[PDB]
Amino acid sequence: KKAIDSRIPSLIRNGVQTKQRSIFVIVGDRARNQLPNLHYLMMSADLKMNKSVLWAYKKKLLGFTSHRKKRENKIKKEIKRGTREVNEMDPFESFISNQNIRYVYYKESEKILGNTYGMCILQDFEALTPNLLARTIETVEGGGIVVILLKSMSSLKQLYTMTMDVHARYRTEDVVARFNERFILSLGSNPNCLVVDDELNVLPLSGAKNVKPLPPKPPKQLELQELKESLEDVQPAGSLVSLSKTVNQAHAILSFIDAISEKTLNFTVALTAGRGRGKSAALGISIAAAVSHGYSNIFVTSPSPENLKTLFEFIFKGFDALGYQEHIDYDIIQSTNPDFNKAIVRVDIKRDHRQTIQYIVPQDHQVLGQAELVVIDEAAAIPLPIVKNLLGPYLVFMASTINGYEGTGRSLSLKLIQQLRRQLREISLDEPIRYAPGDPIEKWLNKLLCLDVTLIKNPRFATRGTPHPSQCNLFVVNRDTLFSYHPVSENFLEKMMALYVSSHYKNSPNDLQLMSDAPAHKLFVLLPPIDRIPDPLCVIQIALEGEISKESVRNSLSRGQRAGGDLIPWLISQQFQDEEFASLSGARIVRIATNPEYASMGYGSRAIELLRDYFEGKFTDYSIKRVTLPPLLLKLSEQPPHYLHYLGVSYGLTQSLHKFWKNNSFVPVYLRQTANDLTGEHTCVMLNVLEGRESNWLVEFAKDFRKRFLSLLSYDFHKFTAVQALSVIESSKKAQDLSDDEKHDNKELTRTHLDDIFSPFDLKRLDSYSNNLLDYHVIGDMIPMLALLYFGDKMGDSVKLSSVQSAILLAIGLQRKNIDTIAKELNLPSNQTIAMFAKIMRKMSQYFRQLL
Amino acid sequence: APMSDVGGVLMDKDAVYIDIEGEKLMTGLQSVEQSIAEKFDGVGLQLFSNGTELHEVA
RNA sequence: GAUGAUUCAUAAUAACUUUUCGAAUCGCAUGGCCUUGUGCUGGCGAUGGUUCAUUCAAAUUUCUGCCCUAUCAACUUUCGAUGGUAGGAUAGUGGCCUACCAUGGUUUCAACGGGUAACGGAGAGGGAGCCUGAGAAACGGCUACCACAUCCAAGGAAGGCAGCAGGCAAUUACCCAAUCCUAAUUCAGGGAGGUAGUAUAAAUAACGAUACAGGGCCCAUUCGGGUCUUGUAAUUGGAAUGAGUACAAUGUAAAUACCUUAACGAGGAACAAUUGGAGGGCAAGUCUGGUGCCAG
RNA sequence: AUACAGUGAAACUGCGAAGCUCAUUAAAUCAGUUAUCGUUUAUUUGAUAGUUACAUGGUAUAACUGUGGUAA
Numbered sequence A: 001k002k003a004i005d006s007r008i009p010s011l012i013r014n015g016v017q018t019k020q021r022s023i024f025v026i027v028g029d030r031a032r033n034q035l036p037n038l039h040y041l042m043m044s045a046d047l048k049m050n051k052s053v054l055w056a057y058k059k060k061l062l063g064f065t066s067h068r069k070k071r072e073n074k075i076k077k078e079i080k081r082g083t084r085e086v087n088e089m090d091p092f093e094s095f096i097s098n099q100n101i102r103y104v105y106y107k108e109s110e111k112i113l114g115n116t117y118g119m120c121i122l123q124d125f126e127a128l129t130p131n132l133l134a135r136t137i138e139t140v141e142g143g144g145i146v147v148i149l150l151k152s153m154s155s156l157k158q159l160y161t162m163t164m165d166v167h168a169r170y171r172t173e174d175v176v177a178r179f180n181e182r183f184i185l186s187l188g189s190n191p192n193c194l195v196v197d198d199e200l201n202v203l204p205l206s207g208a209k210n211v212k213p214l215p216p217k218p219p220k221q222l223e224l225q226e227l228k229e230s231l232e233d234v235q236p237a238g239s240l241v242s243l244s245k246t247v248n249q250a251h252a253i254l255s256f257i258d259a260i261s262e263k264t265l266n267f268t269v270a271l272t273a274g275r276g277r278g279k280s281a282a283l284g285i286s287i288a289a290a291v292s293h294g295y296s297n298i299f300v301t302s303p304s305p306e307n308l309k310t311l312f313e314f315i316f317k318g319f320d321a322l323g324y325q326e327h328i329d330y331d332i333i334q335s336t337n338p339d340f341n342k343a344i345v346r347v348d349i350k351r352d353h354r355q356t357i358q359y360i361v362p363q364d365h366q367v368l369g370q371a372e373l374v375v376i377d378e379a380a381a382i383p384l385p386i387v388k389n390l391l392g393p394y395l396v397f398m399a400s401t402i403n404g405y406e407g408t409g410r411s412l413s414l415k416l417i418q419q420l421r422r423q424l425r426e427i428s429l430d431e432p433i434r435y436a437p438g439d440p441i442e443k444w445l446n447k448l449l450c451l452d453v454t455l456i457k458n459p460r461f462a463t464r465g466t467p468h469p470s471q472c473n474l475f476v477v478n479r480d481t482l483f484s485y486h487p488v489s490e491n492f493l494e495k496m497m498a499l500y501v502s503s504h505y506k507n508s509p510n511d512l513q514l515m516s517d518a519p520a521h522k523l524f525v526l527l528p529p530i531d532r533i534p535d536p537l538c539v540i541q542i543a544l545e546g547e548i549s550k551e552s553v554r555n556s557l558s559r560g561q562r563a564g565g566d567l568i569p570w571l572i573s574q575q576f577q578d579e580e581f582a583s584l585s586g587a588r589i590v591r592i593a594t595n596p597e598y599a600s601m602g603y604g605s606r607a608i609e610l611l612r613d614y615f616e617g618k619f620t621d622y623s624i625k626r627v628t629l630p631p632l633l634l635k636l637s638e639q640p641p642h643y644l645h646y647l648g649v650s651y652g653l654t655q656s657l658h659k660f661w662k663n664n665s666f667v668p669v670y671l672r673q674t675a676n677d678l679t680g681e682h683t684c685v686m687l688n689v690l691e692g693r694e695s696n697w698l699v700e701f702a703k704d705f706r707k708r709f710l711s712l713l714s715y716d717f718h719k720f721t722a723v724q725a726l727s728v729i730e731s732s733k734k735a736q737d738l739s740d741d742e743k744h745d746n747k748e749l750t751r752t753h754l755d756d757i758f759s760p761f762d763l764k765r766l767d768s769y770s771n772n773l774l775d776y777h778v779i780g781d782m783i784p785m786l787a788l789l790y791f792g793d794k795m796g797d798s799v800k801l802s803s804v805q806s807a808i809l810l811a812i813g814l815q816r817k818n819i820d821t822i823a824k825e826l827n828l829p830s831n832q833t834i835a836m837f838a839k840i841m842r843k844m845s846q847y848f849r850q851l852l
Numbered sequence B: 001a002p003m004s005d006v007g008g009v010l011m012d013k014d015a016v017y018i019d020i021e022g023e024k025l026m027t028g029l030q031s032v033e034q035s036i037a038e039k040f041d042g043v044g045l046q047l048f049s050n051g052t053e054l055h056e057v058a
Numbered sequence C: 001g002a003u004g005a006u007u008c009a010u011a012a013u014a015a016c017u018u019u020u021c022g023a024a025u026c027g028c029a030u031g032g033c034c035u036u037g038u039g040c041u042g043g044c045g046a047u048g049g050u051u052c053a054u055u056c057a058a059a060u061u062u063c064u065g066c067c068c069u070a071u072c073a074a075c076u077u078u079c080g081a082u083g084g085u086a087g088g089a090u091a092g093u094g095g096c097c098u099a100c101c102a103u104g105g106u107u108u109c110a111a112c113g114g115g116u117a118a119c120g121g122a123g124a125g126g127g128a129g130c131c132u133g134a135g136a137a138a139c140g141g142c143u144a145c146c147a148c149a150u151c152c153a154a155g156g157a158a159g160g161c162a163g164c165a166g167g168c169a170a171u172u173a174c175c176c177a178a179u180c181c182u183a184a185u186u187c188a189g190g191g192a193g194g195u196a197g198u199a200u201a202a203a204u205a206a207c208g209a210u211a212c213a214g215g216g217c218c219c220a221u222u223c224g225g226g227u228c229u230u231g232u233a234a235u236u237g238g239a240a241u242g243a244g245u246a247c248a249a250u251g252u253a254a255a256u257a258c259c260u261u262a263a264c265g266a267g268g269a270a271c272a273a274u275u276g277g278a279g280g281g282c283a284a285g286u287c288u289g290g291u292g293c294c295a296g
Numbered sequence D: 001a002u003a004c005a006g007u008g009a010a011a012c013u014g015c016g017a018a019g020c021u022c023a024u025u026a027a028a029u030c031a032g033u034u035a036u037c038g039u040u041u042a043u044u045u046g047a048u049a050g051u052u053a054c055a056u057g058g059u060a061u062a063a064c065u066g067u068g069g070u071a072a
């Protein structure tokens, strides 16, 4: 018997008393043997703890198997062999055999999202990713334990170097793994984190150095308990409110019940909450409340019915609280579609009068004419135009998660709310339901992953005024110092992430690991002019793709695992099959972020212009010591650029973004036919060739894309507005203007080609329409061919049209939209469009007669 | 069995009694004196190549 | 040639065949010759192989063989009942099965049916199908169907325990030695098999010496009568041995056990068997009814 | 032991794997007996085949080496 350090038990006991989580880091080969002991201490402190345990690993379990029969056979053979006594089981096997352990791969971390577990084990330290770390820790209840096993020799060596001297970084013989290095330092700050060896000796490096046992034993429960008795008589409110776990949750349910009571169909209720605060539980209870109240047609809409499983589960728990019985008062209908995995689609209720709860796909807004209540769960993941259509003359409940799953940027929610300013009711859920508010682990987790980052308005700019874009200068950011966890770097990393999260539409937690560890990636910042921590105005992230990356790829394949992928080099490869462009080294702008409030001041355009100059060379070792830190920001001159041929972008096609890139001399080369499910936007790739580099290949690519765009307008781009399609054509034609050469030129239609395209009778039919001796419907045949020739430029300078007319011809010929549909888009009377349409065709007839 | 020793862990009063190149690195870790938090205090960071070392945020 | 009997044995001719077989094997030994080449020629076994016979078996088959029965007189052709021809199948005979043909067969001498101290043939969760071998419709395996039930990361996987043995509670441990059996076999194995485990004859005592006392016993309602070595609630001596405490050998595959056998092992022989019955007697004692001192 | 030669895991070949529990049945079970000129028969026992070769092929793989999937 060895006396364990009093720090280890005091931490577990303190966490249980305060319902706060605790992190233990076990270093050593025998680390697994200590887990049974930590579990016993957790239970002995309080018997109300959840006994389930979560075990997360990458590929292999540490020296055992989770199949009961296989372990028993090995034990039986060993007993028969005489190696082991008949009834002897050392603690580790007893821990696995008896306890309820859920073994989960890192890849399938989405399975554990709903569940809650008493203790969490992360087997592999190296393979840790931000998503696997946020998903798992959120499933540990108050007073639970999170255990990380740093068993690898290299991980220990990293721990050794980092503790003795912070600035030094242990770097082995291209992935830098800065996130894991930055991760280790964050533990030292955590007050509830202990780092221990396999012999249960507390290594002093941990933050929980001075933990003392708290004296023996909250306001939130008092403000929650009292509310429950006061409503116990008032059915159905009393039974439903009893299910609430936190004061904020109960207020949300009461607010939902209030909206249900008003019976007015022009109100919207917006519920915003962090993940795990109980948004779905509140919504499911309210749906049960509306059922008992009397609502008949209740609708639920979400990106997929599978996500609604938690919501449906709490609806039944609300039904149970209301005394409804399955197969008597209500019936459950599951999906027959294999894709939805038997997800619940519709619940029909037969009490008092027939009431129906049903799942609808968001696109099917036409059926909402008779809807009394639609619950929009995870409205962040639905495209905004579709959400706009779903806002009909009926009661609406909207649930949006902030920084949960992929979710959406906080500003997009603000862009949603400002639109509502339809009467708007706003509700927010702040208190977590699995642990005490203000848990150090959660605050630790948010700081490490930068989830809770909020953009802050700078009063200093207001006093000094917005800097003119010419004054601003672009500065390179040194990644090593940025992820060194120095307080200045953390604040600067805090500010950079704010611009990141705010602007763009979806951001996964893995993006932080991608930025820190990937070698090809570089970071650029458009700081205000120097004259305090500098606060960025525009941040650009670049990814070097092309021939430069081949050396890294060859090394990765030598390791046995290809790393990452070259999107633009590959994308262009399949579309055009150009061998040269693969060998051409280039850079891809992964993401450009600007302050939304300083939008339209040209900071984004200024940053790109300086970026283009830097790689052109117009401005012409800081690695951390490998077993005092380098400057955080590097001027462009201080670092030599790589040799590049082009700059590439990849984004979902939108008018604002397309106009922004179009103004920066980018040329579209590809536009994906299948719209992205999350956004409904089509992925577009544009390229820009730098001066002093061959540009012929871009022009050929642009011309090929323009033809493909024209033919493909009918298939999947019919939804685009006529102006949008015209603009995309115009940007591609700008690539032709880039080439002063005349080697490639458009060809004027011959007499012979005209004869083959149109028979002599068709020309007579066209002429009659110009003379008004003929109807429109009969000439529907020639419009698409005329549009192809016009935007193919075969007519040449003889025929030209205005922007509005070009949109009209593009719509009928290529979009295949009806005339009346065009009238709405262009805000023109239908009679006027036909008159302009005739004017176009008379010009058409004059040219053909001139050709004849 | 709370009072008794189950597995290898025995609890009496408020103290628990448990039965139980890497070694050189481990014992080195066990003997470190300064905390990680304190070590940052002495370290100053340069924002720019020739700029002053900034220690703490204002 | 053989048998009682044969188209039986055996031989020959003409062909046939998804034409079979007629040592491309192994161990030990290195002899006899000469034409010296490692030239020729070789001894003892094993494992193989065609046919016949023998043996171990198996399958059909002839005839005989103790219940009451008519208040069981008709039964069989009831998807062959009785027989012939031909064919299918079997290892073969054969209604064993199929096509055609005849309308038969059992029985009052008991057919058929019923009852029975006729323990005086079946399957391995339930039916169906199939596979190996000389021998099986296999306590082996496989497929589908029908139920039971287990693990799981819920994508699948596997089972015959739906068993066995108990109660209304320890079936375990040691062996192939002894008798037998299987195998590439003297030697391997066998929960075949074997070994152990958990109403009856004895003892609790036998034999002496001394001292001190005069009463002891039997019958009889009655009164009384009859007879003599008796009593100790006394002291004392030396011998005998069993339960136990146990050294050995014998025993046995080993071991327990049995038999035999050194040393120790008794006076309260405290080395301390009981069960039942019939009578007493005692207090500065307690209670109850009275006609003192009594009665219960 | 300059083909190996003792012993020998694994694997391919060869041989052999053939007490219980329920039901019940009058010479259809069973005992004795006949025949197989009407049959199969591993094994044992005795007989029995004169009708490139100084040794052919992988048309061949296990055991074995090594790379992996899976909760198994």
Ligand SMILES: [Mg+2]
Pocket: none
């Ligand atoms: Mg016949």
Ligand SMILES: [Mg+2]
Pocket: none
């Ligand atoms: Mg005496």
Ligand SMILES: [Mg+2]
Pocket: C273
């Ligand atoms: Mg006795």
Ligand SMILES: [Mg+2]
Pocket: none
């Ligand atoms: Mg023979």
